[PDB]
Amino acid sequence: TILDTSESVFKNVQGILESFGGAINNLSGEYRITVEKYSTNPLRINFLDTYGDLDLSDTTGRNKFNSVQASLVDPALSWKTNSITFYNSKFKEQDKGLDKKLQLS
Amino acid sequence: MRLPDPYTNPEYPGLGFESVNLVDNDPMIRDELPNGKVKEVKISAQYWGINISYPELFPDEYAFLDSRLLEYKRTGDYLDVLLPQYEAFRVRGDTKSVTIPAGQKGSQIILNTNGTLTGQPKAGDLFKLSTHPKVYKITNFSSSGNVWNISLYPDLFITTTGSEKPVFNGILFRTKLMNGDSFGSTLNNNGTYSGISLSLRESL
Amino acid sequence: MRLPDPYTNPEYPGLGFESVNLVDNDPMIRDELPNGKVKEVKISAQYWGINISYPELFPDEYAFLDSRLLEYKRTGDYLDVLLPQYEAFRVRGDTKSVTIPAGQKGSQIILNTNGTLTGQPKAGDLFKLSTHPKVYKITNFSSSGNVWNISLYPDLFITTTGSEKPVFNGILFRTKLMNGDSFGSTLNNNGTYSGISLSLRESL
Amino acid sequence: MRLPDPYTNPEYPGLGFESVNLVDNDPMIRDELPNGKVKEVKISAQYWGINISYPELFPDEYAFLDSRLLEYKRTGDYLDVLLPQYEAFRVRGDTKSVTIPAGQKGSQIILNTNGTLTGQPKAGDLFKLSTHPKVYKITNFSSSGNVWNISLYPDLFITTTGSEKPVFNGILFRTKLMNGDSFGSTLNNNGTYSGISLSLRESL
Amino acid sequence: MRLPDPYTNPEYPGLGFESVNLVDNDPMIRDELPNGKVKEVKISAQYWGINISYPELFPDEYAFLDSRLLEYKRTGDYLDVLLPQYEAFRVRGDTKSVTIPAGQKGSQIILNTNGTLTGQPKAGDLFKLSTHPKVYKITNFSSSGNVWNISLYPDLFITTTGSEKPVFNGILFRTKLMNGDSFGSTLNNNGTYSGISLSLRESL
Amino acid sequence: MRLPDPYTNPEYPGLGFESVNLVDNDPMIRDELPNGKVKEVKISAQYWGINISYPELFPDEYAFLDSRLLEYKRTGDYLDVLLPQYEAFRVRGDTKSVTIPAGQKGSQIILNTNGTLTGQPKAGDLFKLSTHPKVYKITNFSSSGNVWNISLYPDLFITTTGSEKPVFNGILFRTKLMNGDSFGSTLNNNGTYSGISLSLRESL
Amino acid sequence: MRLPDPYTNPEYPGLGFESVNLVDNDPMIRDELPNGKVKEVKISAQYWGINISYPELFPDEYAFLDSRLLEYKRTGDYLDVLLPQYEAFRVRGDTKSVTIPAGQKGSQIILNTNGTLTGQPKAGDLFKLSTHPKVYKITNFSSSGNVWNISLYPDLFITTTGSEKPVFNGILFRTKLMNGDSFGSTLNNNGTYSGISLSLRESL
Amino acid sequence: ASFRDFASNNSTAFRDAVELALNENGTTLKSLGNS
Amino acid sequence: ASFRDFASNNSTAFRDAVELALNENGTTLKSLGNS
Amino acid sequence: ASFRDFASNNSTAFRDAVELALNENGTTLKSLGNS
Amino acid sequence: MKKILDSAKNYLNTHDKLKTACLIALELPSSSGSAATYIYLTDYFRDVTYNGILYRSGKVKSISSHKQNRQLSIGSLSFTITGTAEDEVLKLVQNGVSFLDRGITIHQAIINEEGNILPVDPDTDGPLLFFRGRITGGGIKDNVNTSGIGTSVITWNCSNQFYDFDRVNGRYTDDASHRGLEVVNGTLQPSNGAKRPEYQEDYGFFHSNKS
Amino acid sequence: MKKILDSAKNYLNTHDKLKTACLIALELPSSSGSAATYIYLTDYFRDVTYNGILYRSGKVKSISSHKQNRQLSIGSLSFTITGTAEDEVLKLVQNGVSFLDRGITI
């Protein structure tokens, strides 16, 4: 990484994160760094343990994509930009063949 | 400062409490989970609320009562309220030779009477420490020799320092008069004052 | 703990319910379909609600009552009550030798008295399992010799483990007070506490 | 399931309907234009609302009624309500040899009685099909020979398949008990239960 | 259609208005100027409102009444009513040979009886044109021989086309029900439907 | 137009004012500063509000009153209201030879009676100018020879042009009928009309 | 100005308070601390509020009263009132030769009569300084010969400048009307104005 | 409904309430003068 | 509370009320299409 | 009035209600981090 | 101006009480793109047959208002199902199912005295169209009250083709994107991601990276 | 997952009425950076001793809700003092005093 120190501290931290997941948390006193992961022993919540309210919301539009196109500064080239593009046949077999591309950098 | 009652001032019989209302005010955050379990949370303090009602008042009775209330509002003192129904004398003797071990911050007083007190307090009576103005009600009492085990409704508002002395008789509520922002009394054409009510709150 | 009543404390006949309101509280996701069909889904647990009204209480009886209630508020446990209209001892015998086969969920229940109980529990009477504190209500009864088939209005909260014993007499509701936050008592010039009432609510 | 009434259960005379309230619930969107023309729009269905009031109930009457209501709430069945004022027997005979032509989806039933039915239905009576639980009121009736022209207030909730059979007598409302979320009854000190009301709604 | 009443159905004397409220409903853009002057602009159309209250209705009379009302709700047409206090037949004769010259707008109207009518319509009586269903109210009358000059409270909704005929008797309000959405009837133990009332409202 | 009263129309004794309510409407913006000084601001005008109540009305009395009110609502005129209690004749003579100097825009009228008027107006009477319809009340009156110093409650709504003539007797309120948007009267089964109220406002 | 009353105008005995409500209005920043202590800060100025109720007023008495009130509303000055229950002339003499030493703030006040006044002002009576229009209320009195020590409920609004003279008799409240915006009077058929009442409020 | 008129009489409060949730992160509404 | 649903049913009024306080100065919400 | 305090206690709802009317067209409030 | 039959112009002018029903036809969210199942629903109290299709009742509760300005914007509509059907709940909350590009057509039908559909649209001689678009969103709102009546509402979100305004559909000059290359087992093989099946053997943009 | 002692996991599961107190410890706004004075406060009705520190009562009135998303943001909290103490008022409204970098632990 290169951190342009002329940027703000808040924006620099926000840019260091979102590159590996990450979420700075100030709860319970300390600063805790948490990244996305899968566990074989998660905490079991039944709906009867809740307060009775429940809101389900799935925004498949504007958030579900079938293919990704990314770019990066690759030292294989003379530190120029290289594009990584690939599709998924299963995700396009689903969604009735709609063409939706995820753009990343 | 004592609120005028027909104990100290029997010449004004209209100053008696036509009906008192000892209100238990203990605000709590109560939440009912869908699984049928009701859960409570207590943070704030409990304060005894006293509501006094009065009959028609003659000019002299109202003059005395109003002079006392205006003296209260002038000096900013604390009205003391005496409830006759709580003045049953059970424990008699000296409360200076009794010792209370220090460090008691729960909801229970353990005191060694040292055999200097006759009688035993009854459950539901009024109990108070000598160094704090908060008034307690005895919910349970077990005596094993000279050491007494008095249980109180409000959790001890102070941590005993070992110098406190229990007070069983002559207990007064260190109240502060609420509803004094708009306090008035209408004088009828027959010369008697009507519509006088004292909403008092225990300002320890 | 036990709520005082003339059965536990016969010396205080002023205690005792002047009127008891046993309400049914089953929350439900009711939906009124446009076609006229009404669809309701039961998710939240059901709980009996008890509204107790007291007659004119004399000062000593109220002292005992509020002492017990303040002990309740202090130690924070549950407050058991015994409704007397459901105290018709219609089933004699000792229920220890009565087995309830394990693995039973839902309204229906099967228990084998093994030729011990005498008396038939008619519909409308109360029922309670030995372990769980929930109180049910028998809606229909049918027996084939010793085996008894009982249908209960609330579904069995916990599946029988083969050790739960029936309790056909002396059923107590494990309730919690709902008037605690602001509970006042008025004293009349006649010398009685008037309009004392409780809004209880079964917990779990 | 039938609601207990003094037809099936005359031994409990307190179970009679002290006053019924047949409520016509047909929600409509009514808009009043400034030109004085009031316009209505109907989308939702019409459901008959029945409100039952009861007098003071003795312990046995209340026990029976409460057992029936708890059985209802246990099995999730449908309470059937019978109104005596709508039990005038005019049309008598067999309703199996009568034929209803199919494809009738409006607000009018044309049926060929085939001369098997004596008498004629009167306007304002209660009419119901044998394959649907919705209850209809006859608003008009013209007979031209054996074919009858019965006009109904609620638009036909079903399209006739040709197998439906008209029902004129013995009509019950397939109601579902509303206000059952908080259902209770206070027991007075004299032994009688008071404050019992059934707000029923036709859940077809 | 016609609302049933003792004139149309004398066999049902229970029908008939116990009390009728004929309200005036003229919406207006009223504005209270700061100088004390009140300015009001009439834009929305005026409509008479009729509130009918019925006496104790026996079951058969209510059956007829609600049958007619449900036929109204079914076929969706308008519901005509005849107020009996305005049924004083003060104008004899046949009004077919009475001509109203065309091209007349506003409150004033001029009609030529051609020496046919007998009787003078005094102020406060009703008036209605043959074609339009609006109902007016005569406020002043002045006749010079055969020609009659009548002033009506609501301005003529439609300009006379030279063929409209006066209707001084049997005037029916083309109204619409306003209680249809929730219309319930209670049956007493005495056997009568009590408190039946209608909130009608003239349409157009 | 004059509202019917038992002065002009004594044949209808039911048209008398059972109770009048002269309402002083002078909207002001009143602000109370924390320093105990209450401050007012006046911008809008003051208008006399008159409320009339009526007893049960026979058909002829109601017919006359309703005809007059409908004539008002038809021509859009101004109802004139006469209060008998303000009809004491003190100042008598000609009001045409009296001169009012121009340029008087305050709350005080200085007029030279020129010795043509006998008697003197009393404080609290009703006073009005001949060129404006607003009604004034005399709050004070000092006479120094022929020049009178009349003080009025409402600030002069007009600036005197020198041609105005004071009016002391026969003063009418140029009111406009409020609550006419929904105006009605219920006719009871005994033939008398009830529930008639006139909320009038002075629309100068 | 002076509010009319039987003392100023004995010819009108209808004037005079049927009932007077002298309310105390001290705004305060009251705060209820979580520990049970109640903290209140006095910032806004205190002001006496006077609610006057009149008996049945005959037309001439009401004419005088509302003439005076409308003069008040016109000239915009303050409206003085004299409460008669506090008119007990308990202090004789002329107070011009009574000096109040300068530089005094707070409730306490010291004044030297120089052997002029006769009579002791008991607690509950009124007190007012010559210059400032505020009205206080004596709460306690103590005299050592000629010097008098008086404690007043409201703190001295202005510090004594050495020239203010005591006013123990004829104390007038400098008040402002609070019912002016909508003040109506009803005239009965009996001939009296009923329910005339005033909500006064001391200004400054 | 008649909520539009009201909101139009309290616009600054809406602006502040909006800018108070954008300051949670580094966004703010004073960055519109550039554009 | 249940205020979220309501506001979600009156969004355009919120937008207008916001843009009415930004127009006090030279800011406006139509300058977001560029970014 | 006392509406300011309330709105300051429900700011996120205001933000969402605003962003819900800008998404009608192609505008959104997440385009302020650039500026 | 969407033209209306003159026959409907008489019914809409003479009759005041209009009985209107909205016929909803949404495509089932399915895990794969195979087949096309439709659920037909109506807001009317009885089922309505249109073109031989039985639109069953008892599920739909409310429909939102369709608004269209003169500025390009997504046309959002929201219709709610009862949420206690327990057969519509599982379709929405099913795992591994996507409804990214599932359509929905809503008709506005007027019922006659005899119970039939009054013809309005001239081209079809049937009812008008209220909305036709795509399903973009959804949700269910459970509210279990510990004392009283709870409610559950399933709301489906709808919009037109421009729901994803941040969408860049273009043929970037690259072999990997032009042929839709994807690793299948151990090689980058062309797939169906290409805009045309004939793009799978097009090597036109092979040397575009070093050009 | 902030681990909790199993002993507390029994109390939090068996007892229903929980008596909770929030112990606040804020640094005094001082004109200079010299020294570090602390005011210790509590929301409980009686003073609570923790690690020998007496958290006096009677001042704190309410505390806000601490919310944390998965997007970087300032974690705002708001606790209110009575405002009629007249000894906390002067500390806040004092002239020439700055509290730019004064901490608080709750």
PDB file of C-alpha atoms in Angstrom, chain B residues 15-151:
ATOM      1  CA  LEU B  15     -55.492  21.301  59.851  1.00  0.00           C
ATOM      2  CA  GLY B  16     -55.872  17.553  60.337  1.00  0.00           C
ATOM      3  CA  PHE B  17     -55.186  15.216  57.436  1.00  0.00           C
ATOM      4  CA  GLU B  18     -58.595  14.268  56.051  1.00  0.00           C
ATOM      5  CA  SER B  19     -56.913  11.574  53.931  1.00  0.00           C
ATOM      6  CA  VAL B  20     -53.236  10.739  53.394  1.00  0.00           C
ATOM      7  CA  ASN B  21     -51.840   8.888  50.378  1.00  0.00           C
ATOM      8  CA  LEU B  22     -48.466   7.201  50.898  1.00  0.00           C
ATOM      9  CA  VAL B  23     -47.381   6.605  47.294  1.00  0.00           C
ATOM     10  CA  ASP B  24     -44.614   4.098  46.549  1.00  0.00           C
ATOM     11  CA  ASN B  25     -42.596   5.652  43.709  1.00  0.00           C
ATOM     12  CA  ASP B  26     -39.861   3.295  42.475  1.00  0.00           C
ATOM     13  CA  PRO B  27     -39.401   3.862  38.730  1.00  0.00           C
ATOM     14  CA  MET B  28     -38.257   0.736  36.894  1.00  0.00           C
ATOM     15  CA  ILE B  29     -37.706  -0.260  33.271  1.00  0.00           C
ATOM     16  CA  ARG B  30     -39.980  -3.271  32.751  1.00  0.00           C
ATOM     17  CA  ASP B  31     -39.716  -5.258  29.511  1.00  0.00           C
ATOM     18  CA  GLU B  32     -41.893  -8.245  28.584  1.00  0.00           C
ATOM     19  CA  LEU B  33     -40.190 -10.738  26.295  1.00  0.00           C
ATOM     20  CA  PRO B  34     -42.313 -12.760  23.847  1.00  0.00           C
ATOM     21  CA  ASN B  35     -41.289 -15.951  25.680  1.00  0.00           C
ATOM     22  CA  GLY B  36     -43.525 -14.904  28.586  1.00  0.00           C
ATOM     23  CA  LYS B  37     -40.706 -13.807  30.914  1.00  0.00           C
ATOM     24  CA  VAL B  38     -41.132 -10.294  32.317  1.00  0.00           C
ATOM     25  CA  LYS B  39     -37.842  -8.562  33.142  1.00  0.00           C
ATOM     26  CA  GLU B  40     -37.249  -5.435  35.227  1.00  0.00           C
ATOM     27  CA  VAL B  41     -34.324  -3.025  35.581  1.00  0.00           C
ATOM     28  CA  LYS B  42     -33.917  -0.570  38.469  1.00  0.00           C
ATOM     29  CA  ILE B  43     -31.587   2.435  38.357  1.00  0.00           C
ATOM     30  CA  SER B  44     -33.310   5.453  39.899  1.00  0.00           C
ATOM     31  CA  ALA B  45     -34.097   5.864  43.588  1.00  0.00           C
ATOM     32  CA  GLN B  46     -37.336   5.224  45.468  1.00  0.00           C
ATOM     33  CA  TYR B  47     -39.047   8.211  47.089  1.00  0.00           C
ATOM     34  CA  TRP B  48     -42.109   8.184  49.333  1.00  0.00           C
ATOM     35  CA  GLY B  49     -44.895  10.353  47.927  1.00  0.00           C
ATOM     36  CA  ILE B  50     -47.347  11.906  50.375  1.00  0.00           C
ATOM     37  CA  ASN B  51     -50.610  13.562  49.316  1.00  0.00           C
ATOM     38  CA  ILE B  52     -52.592  15.542  51.892  1.00  0.00           C
ATOM     39  CA  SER B  53     -56.223  16.609  51.547  1.00  0.00           C
ATOM     40  CA  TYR B  54     -57.930  19.236  53.678  1.00  0.00           C
ATOM     41  CA  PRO B  55     -61.516  20.176  54.559  1.00  0.00           C
ATOM     42  CA  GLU B  56     -63.011  23.667  54.491  1.00  0.00           C
ATOM     43  CA  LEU B  57     -60.713  26.011  56.408  1.00  0.00           C
ATOM     44  CA  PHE B  58     -61.716  28.925  58.608  1.00  0.00           C
ATOM     45  CA  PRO B  59     -59.768  32.200  58.263  1.00  0.00           C
ATOM     46  CA  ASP B  60     -57.540  31.552  61.297  1.00  0.00           C
ATOM     47  CA  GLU B  61     -56.709  27.958  60.339  1.00  0.00           C
ATOM     48  CA  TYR B  62     -55.890  29.024  56.788  1.00  0.00           C
ATOM     49  CA  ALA B  63     -53.883  31.985  58.087  1.00  0.00           C
ATOM     50  CA  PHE B  64     -51.728  29.691  60.229  1.00  0.00           C
ATOM     51  CA  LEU B  65     -51.280  27.083  57.488  1.00  0.00           C
ATOM     52  CA  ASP B  66     -50.481  29.689  54.829  1.00  0.00           C
ATOM     53  CA  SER B  67     -48.006  31.457  57.111  1.00  0.00           C
ATOM     54  CA  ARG B  68     -46.204  28.157  57.689  1.00  0.00           C
ATOM     55  CA  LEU B  69     -46.179  27.295  53.977  1.00  0.00           C
ATOM     56  CA  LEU B  70     -44.895  30.753  53.035  1.00  0.00           C
ATOM     57  CA  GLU B  71     -42.196  30.453  55.708  1.00  0.00           C
ATOM     58  CA  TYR B  72     -41.208  27.159  54.075  1.00  0.00           C
ATOM     59  CA  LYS B  73     -41.102  28.725  50.607  1.00  0.00           C
ATOM     60  CA  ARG B  74     -39.122  31.673  51.998  1.00  0.00           C
ATOM     61  CA  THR B  75     -36.362  29.834  53.861  1.00  0.00           C
ATOM     62  CA  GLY B  76     -36.346  26.906  51.424  1.00  0.00           C
ATOM     63  CA  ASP B  77     -36.514  24.457  54.329  1.00  0.00           C
ATOM     64  CA  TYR B  78     -37.897  20.905  54.330  1.00  0.00           C
ATOM     65  CA  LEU B  79     -41.429  20.167  55.503  1.00  0.00           C
ATOM     66  CA  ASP B  80     -41.612  17.339  58.038  1.00  0.00           C
ATOM     67  CA  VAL B  81     -44.766  15.215  57.850  1.00  0.00           C
ATOM     68  CA  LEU B  82     -45.974  12.951  60.662  1.00  0.00           C
ATOM     69  CA  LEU B  83     -48.322  10.052  59.945  1.00  0.00           C
ATOM     70  CA  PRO B  84     -50.284   9.046  63.075  1.00  0.00           C
ATOM     71  CA  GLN B  85     -50.927   5.486  61.879  1.00  0.00           C
ATOM     72  CA  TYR B  86     -47.164   4.797  61.993  1.00  0.00           C
ATOM     73  CA  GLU B  87     -46.673   6.045  65.574  1.00  0.00           C
ATOM     74  CA  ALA B  88     -47.097   2.764  67.452  1.00  0.00           C
ATOM     75  CA  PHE B  89     -44.394   2.603  70.135  1.00  0.00           C
ATOM     76  CA  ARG B  90     -42.925  -0.911  70.179  1.00  0.00           C
ATOM     77  CA  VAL B  91     -39.168  -0.449  70.639  1.00  0.00           C
ATOM     78  CA  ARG B  92     -38.357   1.599  73.744  1.00  0.00           C
ATOM     79  CA  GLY B  93     -35.058   2.464  75.376  1.00  0.00           C
ATOM     80  CA  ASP B  94     -31.822   4.189  74.426  1.00  0.00           C
ATOM     81  CA  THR B  95     -30.636   4.082  70.815  1.00  0.00           C
ATOM     82  CA  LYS B  96     -27.159   5.400  71.685  1.00  0.00           C
ATOM     83  CA  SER B  97     -25.705   2.218  73.215  1.00  0.00           C
ATOM     84  CA  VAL B  98     -26.767   0.144  70.188  1.00  0.00           C
ATOM     85  CA  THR B  99     -24.072  -0.496  67.580  1.00  0.00           C
ATOM     86  CA  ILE B 100     -24.462  -1.019  63.826  1.00  0.00           C
ATOM     87  CA  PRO B 101     -21.497  -2.754  62.130  1.00  0.00           C
ATOM     88  CA  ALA B 102     -20.162  -0.728  59.221  1.00  0.00           C
ATOM     89  CA  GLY B 103     -19.948  -1.659  55.557  1.00  0.00           C
ATOM     90  CA  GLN B 104     -23.638  -2.564  55.184  1.00  0.00           C
ATOM     91  CA  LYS B 105     -24.742  -1.345  51.748  1.00  0.00           C
ATOM     92  CA  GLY B 106     -27.384  -3.935  50.835  1.00  0.00           C
ATOM     93  CA  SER B 107     -31.061  -3.989  51.787  1.00  0.00           C
ATOM     94  CA  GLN B 108     -30.664  -5.331  55.318  1.00  0.00           C
ATOM     95  CA  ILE B 109     -29.483  -3.947  58.669  1.00  0.00           C
ATOM     96  CA  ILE B 110     -27.778  -6.216  61.200  1.00  0.00           C
ATOM     97  CA  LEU B 111     -27.513  -4.482  64.569  1.00  0.00           C
ATOM     98  CA  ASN B 112     -26.474  -5.619  68.050  1.00  0.00           C
ATOM     99  CA  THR B 113     -29.014  -4.125  70.448  1.00  0.00           C
ATOM    100  CA  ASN B 114     -26.689  -4.909  73.397  1.00  0.00           C
ATOM    101  CA  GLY B 115     -29.791  -5.713  75.449  1.00  0.00           C
ATOM    102  CA  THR B 116     -30.555  -2.008  75.875  1.00  0.00           C
ATOM    103  CA  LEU B 117     -33.854  -2.029  73.927  1.00  0.00           C
ATOM    104  CA  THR B 118     -37.131  -3.581  75.065  1.00  0.00           C
ATOM    105  CA  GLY B 119     -39.752  -4.909  72.679  1.00  0.00           C
ATOM    106  CA  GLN B 120     -39.331  -5.909  69.058  1.00  0.00           C
ATOM    107  CA  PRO B 121     -40.176  -4.033  65.845  1.00  0.00           C
ATOM    108  CA  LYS B 122     -43.047  -5.370  63.769  1.00  0.00           C
ATOM    109  CA  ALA B 123     -43.026  -5.942  60.020  1.00  0.00           C
ATOM    110  CA  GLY B 124     -44.477  -3.057  58.042  1.00  0.00           C
ATOM    111  CA  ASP B 125     -43.387  -0.426  60.574  1.00  0.00           C
ATOM    112  CA  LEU B 126     -41.291   2.657  59.773  1.00  0.00           C
ATOM    113  CA  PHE B 127     -37.540   2.594  60.403  1.00  0.00           C
ATOM    114  CA  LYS B 128     -34.904   5.279  59.873  1.00  0.00           C
ATOM    115  CA  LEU B 129     -31.205   5.816  60.511  1.00  0.00           C
ATOM    116  CA  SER B 130     -30.036   8.774  62.578  1.00  0.00           C
ATOM    117  CA  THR B 131     -27.524  10.090  60.015  1.00  0.00           C
ATOM    118  CA  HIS B 132     -29.689   9.937  56.875  1.00  0.00           C
ATOM    119  CA  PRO B 133     -33.162  11.400  56.254  1.00  0.00           C
ATOM    120  CA  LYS B 134     -34.499   8.544  54.105  1.00  0.00           C
ATOM    121  CA  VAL B 135     -37.389   6.587  55.635  1.00  0.00           C
ATOM    122  CA  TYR B 136     -37.484   2.784  55.487  1.00  0.00           C
ATOM    123  CA  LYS B 137     -40.215   0.208  56.046  1.00  0.00           C
ATOM    124  CA  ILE B 138     -39.397  -3.006  57.895  1.00  0.00           C
ATOM    125  CA  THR B 139     -40.363  -5.901  55.625  1.00  0.00           C
ATOM    126  CA  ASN B 140     -39.039  -8.658  57.912  1.00  0.00           C
ATOM    127  CA  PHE B 141     -37.430  -8.978  61.337  1.00  0.00           C
ATOM    128  CA  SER B 142     -35.664 -11.954  62.926  1.00  0.00           C
ATOM    129  CA  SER B 143     -34.064 -11.671  66.368  1.00  0.00           C
ATOM    130  CA  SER B 144     -31.411 -14.189  67.454  1.00  0.00           C
ATOM    131  CA  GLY B 145     -30.399 -13.037  70.918  1.00  0.00           C
ATOM    132  CA  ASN B 146     -29.326  -9.397  70.999  1.00  0.00           C
ATOM    133  CA  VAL B 147     -28.472  -9.130  67.294  1.00  0.00           C
ATOM    134  CA  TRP B 148     -31.435  -8.038  65.168  1.00  0.00           C
ATOM    135  CA  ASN B 149     -31.919  -8.704  61.448  1.00  0.00           C
ATOM    136  CA  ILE B 150     -34.067  -5.873  60.087  1.00  0.00           C
ATOM    137  CA  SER B 151     -34.999  -6.009  56.395  1.00  0.00           C
TER     138      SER B 151
END
